[PDB]
Known about the structure:
The structure is cut from a larger assembly and holds chains A and B. By secondary structure, chain A is an all-beta fold. Chain A has strands at 3-7, 10-12, 18-25, 34-39, 46-51, 60-62, 70-75, 80-85, 94-100, 107-108, 112-116, 125-129, 134-143, 149-152, 161-163, 167-168, 174-182, 192-198, 203-209. Chain A has two domains: 3-116, Immunoglobulin-like (Sandwich); 125-209, Immunoglobulins (Immunoglobulin-like, Sandwich), CATH 2.60.40.10. Chain A contains no helices and 19 strands. In chain A, strands 2, 4, 5, 6, 9, 10 and 11 form a seven-stranded mixed β-sheet that branches. In chain A, strands 12, 13, 15, 16 and 17 form a five-stranded antiparallel β-sheet that branches. Chain A is elongated, with a radius of gyration of 22 Å. Chain B has 28 helices and 29 strands. In chain B, strand 27 (794-797), helix 26 and strand 28 (820-822) form a beta-alpha-beta unit. Chain B is elongated, with a radius of gyration of 35 Å. At the A-B interface, loops of A face helix 1 of B.
Amino acid sequence: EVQLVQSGGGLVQPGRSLRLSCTASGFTFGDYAMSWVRQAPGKGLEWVGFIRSKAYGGTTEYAASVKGRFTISRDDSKSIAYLQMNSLKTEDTAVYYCTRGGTLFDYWGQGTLVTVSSASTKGPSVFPLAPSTAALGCLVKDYFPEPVTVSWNSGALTSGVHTFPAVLQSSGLYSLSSVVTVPSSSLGTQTYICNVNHKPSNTKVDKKVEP
Amino acid sequence: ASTDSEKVAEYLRRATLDLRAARQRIRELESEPIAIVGMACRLPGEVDSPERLWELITSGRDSAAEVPDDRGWRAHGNFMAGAGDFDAAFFGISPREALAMDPQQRQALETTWEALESAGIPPETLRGSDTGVFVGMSHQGYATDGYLLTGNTASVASGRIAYVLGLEGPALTVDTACSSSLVALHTACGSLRDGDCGLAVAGGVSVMAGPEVFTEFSRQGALSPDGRCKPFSDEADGFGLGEGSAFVVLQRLSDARREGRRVLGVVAGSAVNQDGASNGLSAPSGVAQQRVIRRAWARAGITGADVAVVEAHGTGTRLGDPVEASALLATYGKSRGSSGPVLLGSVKSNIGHAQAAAGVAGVIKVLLGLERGVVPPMLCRGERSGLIDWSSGEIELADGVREWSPAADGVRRAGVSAFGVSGTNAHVIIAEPPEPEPRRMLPATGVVPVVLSARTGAALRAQAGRLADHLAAHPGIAPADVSWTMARARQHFEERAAVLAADTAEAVHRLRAVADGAVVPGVVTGSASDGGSVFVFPGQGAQWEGMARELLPVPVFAESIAECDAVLSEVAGFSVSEVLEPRPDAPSLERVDVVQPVLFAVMVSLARLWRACGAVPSAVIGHSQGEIAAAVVAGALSLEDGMRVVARRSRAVRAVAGRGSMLSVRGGRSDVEKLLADDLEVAAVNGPDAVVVAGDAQAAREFLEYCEGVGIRARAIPVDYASHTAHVEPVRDELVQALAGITPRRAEVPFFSTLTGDFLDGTELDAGYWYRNLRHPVEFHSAVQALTDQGYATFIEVSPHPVLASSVQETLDDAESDAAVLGTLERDAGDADRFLTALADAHTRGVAVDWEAVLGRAGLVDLPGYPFQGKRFWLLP
């Protein structure tokens, strides 16, 4: 079956370089143009560029925000398309998709996250949103990299729980907030504990919340 | 910036690609091959299995015999041996309803099950599934006690299978006479292709039950006196009556490839037509048979030259056979195209005319030959019929041992016919199966587990014996294939066993030990209870030379031992690997501050191996150091923290050694406690006949031992401290501040404290707990009694040697509990073989071993199916 298996991303400091791969299978790679499209966190699909098939010259076009910094290449013997990113910026943080075709994108890869940051690994600081139906929660601040997971009462409490997408603050560190809405009987043998877990800095925190 | 030519280039390419997919979908709907994934056959000639059919025909034997007396009947036929036998219990049927049940219904239910086992499908996975049932069958007179209407309607023969097995596709009984089972097959392939079902059972069944059929044909004059069919012979004088079951399991080939099903063959095309206006209601029509053969070629995209074998209707009628030979000569006999003469035969020469089962019995024969590349042989008695023109040389009877040779497509194909007396005809093209082309913990083994299962003990031993015979009969069958089949392609019932062997000869020998009630080295047996597993982590006593050194390879094991190595190297001067692997100037296993952290490491690592293999603890329970291991397995405490508790606690113990002693007293409790008066304390009760007396003051111990000499079996523990006594109180303050940074968490697996005597949350296990655990009596007997009376069915001791296994069994005996007690490693065996044996045993008790994660995936092999334990039921109205 048609396959476009991507690989080659991850964390990388600004100014450095990074090359993504797209390995095709199940179809005649050399017959297609191949394009790269990216999506910054939360935002839209943005065109990066493409390379024509050899039959149409095997030539390349790029978006203005990457021209001279990024270059697209292809290797029809290994059926691989490449994106070579140079002089990376934080603004180049995104999921990168390769896609079959240069005008009709009729098959896409799973995508590859590229995070451009000079932040160093760091554990979270957990603060409780005391329950000023009652609402209480946990504020998981100032960690790096993602992810960080949160549960309530070691997974016993799942009804009324919302854990929010992490946000990236100007410091370059991430912050996440988790909340649970509970009956105002907030003392009736109902102790509430958020369990936050940040593997990339070997951190495990349990916090109680109360007024 | 893209030229118009480039853009329209990509749309055109997409349009023609979409067109290729559409036209491939059209071909699928019209002519997708239907994979035959399973087959069962209970036919005359003592043929209980498809392979028995192969043996009967390559041995040139037939089956004609005088009528049996078991039925309430100058009279010969072809009869099934156990037509009346039925395991009513297996299917949840009362013996009252089973007696009232047409044998046709009973034989269909049993043969369907075997077909599902031949397809490697554990029938429980099909409950609520989309599976159809297509039974070719004809009403016979069995009832001429209640449930007699449901036991004799034709519609219930198909619906009863749906009900028992919980299937939800269409369930039809169809009657087209001798063509009934090929029509059933044809309808099921249409149903699969229409997506009405995703799997189908199709076939036919008949059993001679009522007075009519045999005497009805005698007056009619179509019967031979021998009871033998002589198809295509000048000695043809009628057909011999027969009976049987014959079913196949049908699946769209694309789905069978995708689920990795062994395919026996494919239905490449079939057709069903009618004689129409012929010389009479029962008269065959040669032109109608050409029409149906040519339609089958159309729907398979082949021509006559591509089929090398024809399995004919062949009944042995003097004027029936020339009609069929004429129609074959005009189709298969022309345009042979130097493919060699087509080879002709009829399973009816060997088993008689199986009536509604004739057709799929012919398919089953053809599949047998396709497995081996060998033309399926026919008896062929006497000379070729003078009424038939073999002058062309293009049709030849399948006399003996012939190589089955493929067509220009390199594919081996056969055509199968069945013509009914009502006039409805069928022909099916069976092609050989396409090429099938396409991660293990406990990696290297050498030996191999074979698990067995049945509803009762006698059925279990029968399964062992029959698998023993089959393996003795077929050496060279890969043991990994027997194991994977028996583990994954079979359903698991309550009574279980497993044999662990390195070669087919050892497997046969140990399977026969299971067939007898024998208790031999590589054999385990038990019954499967639900209720959950308790992982048991004992106290002192499990150590041995490089315990589990052989397990250090297994990647999930060595992974865990690595984390212990890091943590233990910072906290103490040494590591676990130095002590277990060869010891080059490494700490001595005799030191209490090395054996306890090293044991901790081996038990946590074993428990992880167990879990990686599918065994889930429902609770944990420890004994002194051991509750530390349990606390980590249960997630109350990280591995780092637990390795810190055991390191620092055993170093504290070392600091107070000397002047202490511990002895084991084979006695009850209050008893020893009473005796303890004057003459110091009970530090452990583990079992109702096993107390550990400490009190140190070794002098005291030295005295009690003496006294015990009178009659009490007492033995000294090779250890010079006295824990669970006041002897440990000096370490209290230093140990509780040394462990002040431990972080106990809520346990993910329930945790039963033999200190508290009840389940704990997990956060209670701070440094203070670990001191009390060292200071206070280990109330372990109570802890087992508590867990038994809450329903736990399996106790697994996770340790490099069993120490508490005995005392747990004793406690269960006094509680009259059925619960099992298993171990993990043993002193002599800490290898991957001993652990495989531990898994095998845990399996026989209900533990869920992902046998596929442990061994890998092998191939399905045709092993015997369930050993039905039938009583006879034959109503005589």
